[PDB]
Structure 1
Amino acid sequence: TQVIVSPNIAAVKQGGQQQFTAYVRATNAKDHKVVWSVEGGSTGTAITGD
């Protein structure tokens, strides 16, 4: 029903990096794949998954 990406706000240095984590609201007894993405970046600036 909801995916909660946890920190919700980052002020990352140019060049530096940041850890994110996503809480998935499974309403049933399963596990669901998370796909991470970054839109609006330059050439580079990727999120690795995870």
Structure 2
Amino acid sequence: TQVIVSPNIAAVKQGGQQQFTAYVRATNAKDHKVVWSVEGGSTGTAITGD
């Protein structure tokens, strides 16, 4: 039903990092996989599958 990336709002210092966690509000625990993605910026910005 919904996904709550937990850090609602965060500021990140250039050169740093911030792990975000997606809480998946759902019915049954059907092993719903989560796809991480980040938009905007340059190629120096990326996000892992965690």
If the length of structure 1 is used for normalisation, what is the TM-score?
Answer: 0.88
Q: Distance in 1 between matches of 2:17 and 2:29?
A: 34
Residues 4-46 of structure 1: per-residue CA shift (max 9 Å, x gap): 0001111100111111100011212311010000010201210
- Structure with more of its chain in strand, by fraction: 2
4+ runs deviating over 4 angstroms: none
Residue 36 of structure 2 is matched in structure 1 by 36
Number of aligned residue pairs: 50
Gaps of 5+ in 2: none
Gaps of 5+ in 1: none
User: What SS is found at the alignment partner of 2:23?
Assistant: strand
Pairwise CA RMSD: 1.0
